[PDB]
């Protein structure tokens, strides 16, 4: 199931929905989590915190089913709103979702 991108809420951006599964069985080998490293508590120039992908394992789920790259801002993790949450916040969000066999992350390009 590929990912899709629909018009943002401002009509000037594209917000797609990315679904990742921590099955750990990508074509590469086993991986570890889903396929990309994310960061939290990244205070932007707007005045709010968010999440950013530090890196993506070429071949992992996040790459094949997600299709993103380090630098993308994920305003949604596991169907939860991250905007406003700091590094410690995201930590709880993701970690809590790290146990789930499926995840839903959204970004903004």
């Amino acid at each position: 199931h590929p990912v899709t991108w629909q018009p943002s809420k401002e009509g000037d951006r594209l917000i797609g929905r990315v679904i990742l599964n921590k099955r750990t069985t990508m074509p590469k080998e086993s991986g570890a989590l889903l396929g990309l490293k994310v960061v939290g508590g990244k205070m932007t120039d707007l005045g709010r915190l968010g999440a950013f992908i530090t890196k993506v394992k070429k071949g992992s789920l996040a790459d094949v089913v997600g299709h993103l790259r380090a630098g993308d801002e994920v305003l949604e993790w596991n169907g939860k709103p991250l905007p406003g949450a700091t590094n410690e916040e995201v930590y709880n969000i993701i970690l809590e979702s790290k146990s789930e066999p499926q995840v839903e992350i959204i970004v903004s390009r």
Binding site: L20, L33, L36, G40, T54, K98
Partner: peptide, 6 residues
């Protein structure tokens, strides 16, 4: 600069 492993 990291945060969580995914």
């Amino acid at each position: 600069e990291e945060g969580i492993w995914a």
